[PDB]
mmCIF file of N, CA and C in Angstrom:
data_model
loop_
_atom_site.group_PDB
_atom_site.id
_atom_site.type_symbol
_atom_site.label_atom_id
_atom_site.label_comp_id
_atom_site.label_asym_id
_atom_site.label_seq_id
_atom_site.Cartn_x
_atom_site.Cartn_y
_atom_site.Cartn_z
ATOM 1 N N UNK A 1 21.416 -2.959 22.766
ATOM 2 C CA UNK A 1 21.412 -1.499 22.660
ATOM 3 C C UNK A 1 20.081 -0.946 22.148
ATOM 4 N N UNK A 2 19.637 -0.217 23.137
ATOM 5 C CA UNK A 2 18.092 -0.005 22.663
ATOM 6 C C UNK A 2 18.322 1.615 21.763
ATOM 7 N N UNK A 3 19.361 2.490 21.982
ATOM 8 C CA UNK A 3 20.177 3.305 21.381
ATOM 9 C C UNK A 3 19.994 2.749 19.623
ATOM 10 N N UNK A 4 20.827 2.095 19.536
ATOM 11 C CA UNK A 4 20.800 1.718 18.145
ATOM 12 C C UNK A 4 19.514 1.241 17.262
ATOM 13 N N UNK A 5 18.796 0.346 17.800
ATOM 14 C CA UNK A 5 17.700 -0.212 17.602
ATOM 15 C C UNK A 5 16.732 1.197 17.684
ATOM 16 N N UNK A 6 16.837 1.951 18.023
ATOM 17 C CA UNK A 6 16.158 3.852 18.164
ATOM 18 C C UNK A 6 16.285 4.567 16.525
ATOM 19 N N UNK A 7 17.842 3.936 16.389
ATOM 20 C CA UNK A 7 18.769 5.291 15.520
ATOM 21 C C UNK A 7 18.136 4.478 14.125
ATOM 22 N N UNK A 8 18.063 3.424 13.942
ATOM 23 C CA UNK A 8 17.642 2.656 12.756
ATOM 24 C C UNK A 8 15.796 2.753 12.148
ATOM 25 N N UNK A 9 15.284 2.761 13.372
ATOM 26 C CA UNK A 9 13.503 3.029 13.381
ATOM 27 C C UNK A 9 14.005 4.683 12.831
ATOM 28 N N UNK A 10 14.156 5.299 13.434
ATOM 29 C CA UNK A 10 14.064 6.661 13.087
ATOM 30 C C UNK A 10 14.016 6.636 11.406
ATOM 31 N N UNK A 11 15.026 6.153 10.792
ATOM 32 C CA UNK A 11 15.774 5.995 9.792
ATOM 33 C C UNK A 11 14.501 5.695 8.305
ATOM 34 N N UNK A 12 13.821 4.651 9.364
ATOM 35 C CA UNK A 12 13.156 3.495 8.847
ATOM 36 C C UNK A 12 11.965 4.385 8.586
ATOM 37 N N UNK A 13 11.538 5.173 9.698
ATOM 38 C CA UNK A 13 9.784 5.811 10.235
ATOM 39 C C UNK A 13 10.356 7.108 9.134
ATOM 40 N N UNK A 14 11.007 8.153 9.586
ATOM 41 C CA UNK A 14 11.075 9.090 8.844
ATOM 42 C C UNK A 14 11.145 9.342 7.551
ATOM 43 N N UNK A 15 12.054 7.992 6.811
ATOM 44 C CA UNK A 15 11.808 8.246 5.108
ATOM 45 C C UNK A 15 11.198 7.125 4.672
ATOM 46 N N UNK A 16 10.239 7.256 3.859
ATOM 47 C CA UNK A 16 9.657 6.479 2.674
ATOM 48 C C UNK A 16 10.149 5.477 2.405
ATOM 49 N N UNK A 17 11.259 5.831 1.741
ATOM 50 C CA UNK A 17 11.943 4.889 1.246
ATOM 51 C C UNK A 17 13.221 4.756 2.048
ATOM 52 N N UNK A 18 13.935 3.844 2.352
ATOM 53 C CA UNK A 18 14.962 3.312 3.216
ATOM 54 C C UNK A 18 15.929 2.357 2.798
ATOM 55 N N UNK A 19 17.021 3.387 2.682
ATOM 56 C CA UNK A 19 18.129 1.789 2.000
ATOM 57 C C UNK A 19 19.281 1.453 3.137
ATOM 58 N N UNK A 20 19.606 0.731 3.190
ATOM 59 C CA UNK A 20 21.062 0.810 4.574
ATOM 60 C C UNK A 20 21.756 0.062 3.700
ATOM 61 N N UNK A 21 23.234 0.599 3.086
ATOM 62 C CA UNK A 21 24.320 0.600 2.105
ATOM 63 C C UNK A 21 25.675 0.519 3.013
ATOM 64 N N UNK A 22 26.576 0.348 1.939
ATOM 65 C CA UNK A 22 28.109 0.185 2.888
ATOM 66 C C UNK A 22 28.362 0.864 1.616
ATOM 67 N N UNK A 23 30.187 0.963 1.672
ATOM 68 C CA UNK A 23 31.292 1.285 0.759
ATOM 69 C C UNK A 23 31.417 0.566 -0.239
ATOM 70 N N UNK A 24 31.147 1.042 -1.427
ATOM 71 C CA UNK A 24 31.669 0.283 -2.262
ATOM 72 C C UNK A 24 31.181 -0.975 -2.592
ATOM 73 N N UNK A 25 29.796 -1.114 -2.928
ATOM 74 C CA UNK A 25 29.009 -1.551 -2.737
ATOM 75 C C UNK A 25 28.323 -2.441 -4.415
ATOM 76 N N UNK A 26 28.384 -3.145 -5.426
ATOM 77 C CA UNK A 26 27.832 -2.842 -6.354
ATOM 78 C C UNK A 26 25.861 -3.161 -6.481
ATOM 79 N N UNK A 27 25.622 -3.860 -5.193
ATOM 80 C CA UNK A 27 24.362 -3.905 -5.633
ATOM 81 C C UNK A 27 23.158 -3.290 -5.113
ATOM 82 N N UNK A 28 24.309 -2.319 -3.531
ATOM 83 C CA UNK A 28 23.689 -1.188 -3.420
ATOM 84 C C UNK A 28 23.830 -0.028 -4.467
ATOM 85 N N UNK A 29 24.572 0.300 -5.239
ATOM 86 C CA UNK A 29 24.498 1.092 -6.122
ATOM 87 C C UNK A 29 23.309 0.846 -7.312
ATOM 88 N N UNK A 30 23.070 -0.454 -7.461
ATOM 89 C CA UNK A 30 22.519 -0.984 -8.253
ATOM 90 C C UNK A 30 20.958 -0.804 -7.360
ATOM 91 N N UNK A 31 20.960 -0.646 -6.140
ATOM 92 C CA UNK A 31 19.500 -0.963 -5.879
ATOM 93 C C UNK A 31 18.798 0.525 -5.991
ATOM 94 N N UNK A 32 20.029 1.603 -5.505
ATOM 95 C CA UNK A 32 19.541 2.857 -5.450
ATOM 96 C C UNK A 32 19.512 3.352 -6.446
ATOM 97 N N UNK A 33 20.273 3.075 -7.543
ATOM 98 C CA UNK A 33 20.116 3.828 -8.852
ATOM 99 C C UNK A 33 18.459 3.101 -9.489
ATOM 100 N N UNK A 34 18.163 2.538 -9.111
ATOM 101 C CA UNK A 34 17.009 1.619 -9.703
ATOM 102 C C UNK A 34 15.399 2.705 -9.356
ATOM 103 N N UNK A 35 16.378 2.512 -7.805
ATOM 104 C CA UNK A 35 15.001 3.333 -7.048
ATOM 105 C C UNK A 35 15.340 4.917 -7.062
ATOM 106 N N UNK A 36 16.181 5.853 -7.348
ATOM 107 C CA UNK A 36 15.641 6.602 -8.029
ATOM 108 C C UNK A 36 15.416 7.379 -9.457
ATOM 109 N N UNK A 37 15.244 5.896 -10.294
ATOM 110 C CA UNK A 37 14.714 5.900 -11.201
ATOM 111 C C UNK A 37 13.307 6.346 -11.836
ATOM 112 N N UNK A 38 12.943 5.897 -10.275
ATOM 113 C CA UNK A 38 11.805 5.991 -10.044
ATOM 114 C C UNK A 38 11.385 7.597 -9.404
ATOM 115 N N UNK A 39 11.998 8.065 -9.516
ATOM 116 C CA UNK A 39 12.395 10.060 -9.014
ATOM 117 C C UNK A 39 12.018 9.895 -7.844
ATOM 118 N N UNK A 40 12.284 8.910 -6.655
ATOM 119 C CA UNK A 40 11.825 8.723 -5.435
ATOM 120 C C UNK A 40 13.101 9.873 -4.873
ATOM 121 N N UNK A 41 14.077 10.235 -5.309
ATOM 122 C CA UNK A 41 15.117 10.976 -4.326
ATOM 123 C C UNK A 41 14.216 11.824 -3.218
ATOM 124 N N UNK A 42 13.313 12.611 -3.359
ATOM 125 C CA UNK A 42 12.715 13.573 -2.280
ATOM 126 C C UNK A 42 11.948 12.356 -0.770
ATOM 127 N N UNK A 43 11.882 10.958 -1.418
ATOM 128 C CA UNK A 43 11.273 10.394 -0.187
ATOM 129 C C UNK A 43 12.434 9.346 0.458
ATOM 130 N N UNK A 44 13.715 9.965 -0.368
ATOM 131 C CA UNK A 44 14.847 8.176 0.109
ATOM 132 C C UNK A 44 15.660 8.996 1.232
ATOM 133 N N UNK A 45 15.934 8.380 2.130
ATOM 134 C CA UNK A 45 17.494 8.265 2.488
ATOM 135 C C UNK A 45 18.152 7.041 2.739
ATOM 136 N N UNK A 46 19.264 7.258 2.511
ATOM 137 C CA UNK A 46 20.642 6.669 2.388
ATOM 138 C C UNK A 46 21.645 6.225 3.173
ATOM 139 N N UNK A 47 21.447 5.035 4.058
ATOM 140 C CA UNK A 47 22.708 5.102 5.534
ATOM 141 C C UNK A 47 23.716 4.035 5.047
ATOM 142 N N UNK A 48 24.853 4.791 4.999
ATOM 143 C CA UNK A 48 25.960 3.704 4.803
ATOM 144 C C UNK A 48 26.500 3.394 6.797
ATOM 145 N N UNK A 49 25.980 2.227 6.252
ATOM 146 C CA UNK A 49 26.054 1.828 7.875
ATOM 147 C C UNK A 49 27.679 1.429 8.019
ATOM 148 N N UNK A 50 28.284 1.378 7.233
ATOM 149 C CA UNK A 50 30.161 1.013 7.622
ATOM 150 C C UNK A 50 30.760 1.823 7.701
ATOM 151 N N UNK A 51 30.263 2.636 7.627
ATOM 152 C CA UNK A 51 30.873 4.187 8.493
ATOM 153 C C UNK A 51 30.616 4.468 9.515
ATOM 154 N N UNK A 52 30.525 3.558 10.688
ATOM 155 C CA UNK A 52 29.592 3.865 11.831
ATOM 156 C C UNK A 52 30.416 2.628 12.532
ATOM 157 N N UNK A 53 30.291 3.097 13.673
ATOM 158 C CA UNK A 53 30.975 2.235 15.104
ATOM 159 C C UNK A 53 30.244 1.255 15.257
ATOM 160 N N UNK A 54 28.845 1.473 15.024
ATOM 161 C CA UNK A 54 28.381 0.505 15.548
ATOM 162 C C UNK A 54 27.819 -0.496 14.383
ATOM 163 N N UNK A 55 28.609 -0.866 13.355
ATOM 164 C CA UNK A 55 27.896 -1.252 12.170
ATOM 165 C C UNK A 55 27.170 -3.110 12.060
ATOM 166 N N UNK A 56 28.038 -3.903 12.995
ATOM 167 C CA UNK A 56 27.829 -4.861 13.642
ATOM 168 C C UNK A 56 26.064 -5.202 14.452
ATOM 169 N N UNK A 57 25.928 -3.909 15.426
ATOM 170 C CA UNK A 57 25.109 -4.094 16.137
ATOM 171 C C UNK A 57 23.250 -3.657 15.378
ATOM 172 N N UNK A 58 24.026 -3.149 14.034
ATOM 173 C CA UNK A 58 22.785 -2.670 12.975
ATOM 174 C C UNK A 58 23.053 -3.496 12.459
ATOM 175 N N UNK A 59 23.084 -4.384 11.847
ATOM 176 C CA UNK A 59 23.067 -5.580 10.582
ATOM 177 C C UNK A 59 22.368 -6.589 11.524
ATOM 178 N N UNK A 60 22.737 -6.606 13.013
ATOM 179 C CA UNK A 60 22.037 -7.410 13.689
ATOM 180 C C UNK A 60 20.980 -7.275 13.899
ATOM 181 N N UNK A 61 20.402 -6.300 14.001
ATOM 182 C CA UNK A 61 19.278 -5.431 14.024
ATOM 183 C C UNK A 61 18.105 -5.407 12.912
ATOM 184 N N UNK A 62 19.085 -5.406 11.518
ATOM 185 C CA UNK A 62 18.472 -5.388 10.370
ATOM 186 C C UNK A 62 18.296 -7.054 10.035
ATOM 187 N N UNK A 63 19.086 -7.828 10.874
ATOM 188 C CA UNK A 63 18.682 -9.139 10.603
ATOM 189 C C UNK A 63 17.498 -9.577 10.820
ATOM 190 N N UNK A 64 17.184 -9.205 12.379
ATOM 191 C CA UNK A 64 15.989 -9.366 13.597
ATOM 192 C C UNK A 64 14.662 -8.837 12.531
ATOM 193 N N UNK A 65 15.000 -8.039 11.650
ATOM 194 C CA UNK A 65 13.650 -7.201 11.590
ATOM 195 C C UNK A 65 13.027 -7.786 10.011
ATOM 196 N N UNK A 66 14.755 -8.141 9.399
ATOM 197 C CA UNK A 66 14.112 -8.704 7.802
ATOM 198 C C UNK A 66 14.435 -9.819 7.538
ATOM 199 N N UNK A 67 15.447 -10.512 8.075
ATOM 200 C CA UNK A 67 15.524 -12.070 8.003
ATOM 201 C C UNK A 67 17.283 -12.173 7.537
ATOM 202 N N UNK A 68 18.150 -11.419 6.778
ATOM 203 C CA UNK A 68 19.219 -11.324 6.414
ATOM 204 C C UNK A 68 20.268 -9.846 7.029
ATOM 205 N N UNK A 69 21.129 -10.375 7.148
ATOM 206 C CA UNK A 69 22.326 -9.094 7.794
ATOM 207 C C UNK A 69 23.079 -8.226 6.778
ATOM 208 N N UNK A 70 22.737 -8.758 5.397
ATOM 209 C CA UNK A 70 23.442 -8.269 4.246
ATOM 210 C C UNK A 70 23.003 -6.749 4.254
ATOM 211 N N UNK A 71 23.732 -6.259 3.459
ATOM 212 C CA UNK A 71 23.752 -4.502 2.313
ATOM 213 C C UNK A 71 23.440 -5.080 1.231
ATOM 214 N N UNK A 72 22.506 -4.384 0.110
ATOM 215 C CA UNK A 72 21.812 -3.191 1.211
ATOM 216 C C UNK A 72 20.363 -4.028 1.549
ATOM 217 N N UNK A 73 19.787 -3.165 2.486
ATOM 218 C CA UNK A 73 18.411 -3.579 2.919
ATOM 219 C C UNK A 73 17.374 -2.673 3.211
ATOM 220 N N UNK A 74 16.580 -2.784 2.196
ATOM 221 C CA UNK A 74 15.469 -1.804 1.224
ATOM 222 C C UNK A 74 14.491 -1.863 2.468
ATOM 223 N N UNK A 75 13.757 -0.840 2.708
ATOM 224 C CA UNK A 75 12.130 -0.714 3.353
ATOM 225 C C UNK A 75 12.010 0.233 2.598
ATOM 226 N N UNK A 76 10.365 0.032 2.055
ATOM 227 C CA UNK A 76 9.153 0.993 1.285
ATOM 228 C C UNK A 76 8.098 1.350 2.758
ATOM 229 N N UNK A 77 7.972 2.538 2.974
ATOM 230 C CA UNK A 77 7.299 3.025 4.260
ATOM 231 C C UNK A 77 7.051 1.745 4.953
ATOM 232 N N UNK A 78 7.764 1.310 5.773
ATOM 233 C CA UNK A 78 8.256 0.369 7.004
ATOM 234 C C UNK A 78 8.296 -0.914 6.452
ATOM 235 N N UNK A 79 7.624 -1.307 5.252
ATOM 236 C CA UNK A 79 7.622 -2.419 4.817
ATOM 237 C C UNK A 79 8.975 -3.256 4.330
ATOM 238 N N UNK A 80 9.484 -4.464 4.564
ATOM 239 C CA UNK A 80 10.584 -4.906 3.914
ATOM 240 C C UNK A 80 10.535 -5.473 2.113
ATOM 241 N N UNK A 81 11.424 -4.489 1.675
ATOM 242 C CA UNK A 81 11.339 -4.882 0.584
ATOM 243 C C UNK A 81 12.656 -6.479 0.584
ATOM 244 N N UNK A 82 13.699 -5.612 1.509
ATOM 245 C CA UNK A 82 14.583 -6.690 0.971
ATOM 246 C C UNK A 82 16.106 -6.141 0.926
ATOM 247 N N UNK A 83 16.532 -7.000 -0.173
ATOM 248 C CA UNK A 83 17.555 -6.854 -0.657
ATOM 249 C C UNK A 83 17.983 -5.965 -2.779
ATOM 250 N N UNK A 84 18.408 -6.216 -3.159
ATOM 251 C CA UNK A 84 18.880 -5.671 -4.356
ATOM 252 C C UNK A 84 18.224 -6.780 -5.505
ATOM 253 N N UNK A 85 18.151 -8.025 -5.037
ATOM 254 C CA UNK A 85 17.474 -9.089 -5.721
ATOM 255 C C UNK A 85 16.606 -9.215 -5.720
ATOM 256 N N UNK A 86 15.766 -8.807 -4.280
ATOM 257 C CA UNK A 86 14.141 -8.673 -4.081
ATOM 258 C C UNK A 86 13.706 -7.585 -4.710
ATOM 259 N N UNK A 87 14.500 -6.382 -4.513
ATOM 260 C CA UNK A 87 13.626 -5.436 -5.441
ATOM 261 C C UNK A 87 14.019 -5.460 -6.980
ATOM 262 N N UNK A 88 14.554 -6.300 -8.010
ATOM 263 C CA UNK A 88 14.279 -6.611 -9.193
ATOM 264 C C UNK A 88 13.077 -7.286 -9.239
ATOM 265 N N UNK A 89 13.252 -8.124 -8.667
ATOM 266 C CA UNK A 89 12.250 -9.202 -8.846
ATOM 267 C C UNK A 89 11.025 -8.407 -8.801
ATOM 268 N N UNK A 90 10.756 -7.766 -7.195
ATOM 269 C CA UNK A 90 9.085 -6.694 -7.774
ATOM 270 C C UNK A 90 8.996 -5.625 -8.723
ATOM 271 N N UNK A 91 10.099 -5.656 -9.541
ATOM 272 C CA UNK A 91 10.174 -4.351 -10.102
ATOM 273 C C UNK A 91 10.457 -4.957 -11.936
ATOM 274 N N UNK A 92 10.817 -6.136 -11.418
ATOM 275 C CA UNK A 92 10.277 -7.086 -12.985
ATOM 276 C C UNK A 92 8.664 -7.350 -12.885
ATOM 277 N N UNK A 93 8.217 -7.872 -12.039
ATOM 278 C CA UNK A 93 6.900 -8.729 -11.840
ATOM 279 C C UNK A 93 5.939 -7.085 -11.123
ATOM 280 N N UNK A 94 5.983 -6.382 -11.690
ATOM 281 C CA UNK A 94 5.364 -4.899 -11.069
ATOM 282 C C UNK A 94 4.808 -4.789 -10.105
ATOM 283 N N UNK A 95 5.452 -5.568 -8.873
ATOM 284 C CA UNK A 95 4.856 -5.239 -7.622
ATOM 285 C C UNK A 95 5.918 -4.053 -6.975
ATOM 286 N N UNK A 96 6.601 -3.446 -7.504
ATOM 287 C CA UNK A 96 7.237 -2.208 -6.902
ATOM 288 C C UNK A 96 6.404 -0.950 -7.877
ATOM 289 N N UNK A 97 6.029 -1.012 -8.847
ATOM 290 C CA UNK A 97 5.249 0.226 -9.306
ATOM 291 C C UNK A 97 4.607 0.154 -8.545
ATOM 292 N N UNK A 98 3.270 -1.282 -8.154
ATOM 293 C CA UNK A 98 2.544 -0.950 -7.214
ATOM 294 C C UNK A 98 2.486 -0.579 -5.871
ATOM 295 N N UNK A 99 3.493 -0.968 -5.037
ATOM 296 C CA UNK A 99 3.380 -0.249 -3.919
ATOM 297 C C UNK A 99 3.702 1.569 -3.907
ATOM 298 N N UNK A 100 4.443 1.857 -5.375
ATOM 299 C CA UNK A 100 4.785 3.178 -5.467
ATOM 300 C C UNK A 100 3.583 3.746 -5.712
ATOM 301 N N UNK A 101 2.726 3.191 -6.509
ATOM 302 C CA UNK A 101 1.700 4.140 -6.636
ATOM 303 C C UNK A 101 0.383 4.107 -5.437
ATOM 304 N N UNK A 102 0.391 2.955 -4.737
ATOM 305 C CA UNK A 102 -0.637 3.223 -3.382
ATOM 306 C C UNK A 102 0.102 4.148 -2.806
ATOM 307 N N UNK A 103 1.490 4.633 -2.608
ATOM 308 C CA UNK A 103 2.067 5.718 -2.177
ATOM 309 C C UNK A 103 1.818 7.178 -2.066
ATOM 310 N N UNK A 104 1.275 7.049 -3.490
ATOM 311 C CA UNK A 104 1.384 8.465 -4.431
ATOM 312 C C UNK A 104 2.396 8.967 -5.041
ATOM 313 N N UNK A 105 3.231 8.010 -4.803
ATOM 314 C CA UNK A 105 4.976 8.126 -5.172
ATOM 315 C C UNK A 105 5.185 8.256 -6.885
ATOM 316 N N UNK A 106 4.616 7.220 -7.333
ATOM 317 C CA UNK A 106 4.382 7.478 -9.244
ATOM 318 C C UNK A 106 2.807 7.334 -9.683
ATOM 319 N N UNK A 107 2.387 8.329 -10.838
ATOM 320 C CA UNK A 107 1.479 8.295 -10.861
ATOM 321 C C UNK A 107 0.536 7.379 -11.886
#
């Protein structure tokens, strides 16, 4: 589906920051409360992809592009951050301040 693989870039290109979440979730809650900690809310959005028909054919998608099919799965302007574990880890070892601030995101 080149449709879907469309609806996810969009997702990806248009915000900054990029999380793809499900229901009920604890370490998507945990990844987004982290990141906007960081007062990123004006550059994030938020897709709970299990609300969606096609939620299967995006995890596959999100596999192809970052290596895992899991929720949630972080991009910093197109870049893969990851998962909820990857972004502690740069955000212990301050490689997430730094990509925020080549951003202009924190100052």
């Amino acid at each position: 589906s080149e449709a879907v693989k469309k609806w996810v870039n969009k997702i990806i290109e248009e915000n900054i920051i990029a999380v793809f979440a499900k229901t009920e979730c604890p370490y998507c809650i945990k990844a987004i409360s982290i990141l906007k900690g960081y007062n990123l809310n004006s550059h994030m959005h938020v897709e709970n992809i299990e609300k969606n028909p096609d939620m299967a054919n995006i995890q596959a998608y999100l596999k192809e592009l970052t290596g895992k099919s899991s929720v949630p799965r972080i991009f910093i302007n197109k870049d893969v951050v990851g998962g909820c574990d990857d972004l502690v880890k740069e955000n212990d070892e301050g490689k997430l301040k730094e990509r925020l601030q080549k951003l202009g995101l924190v100052n």
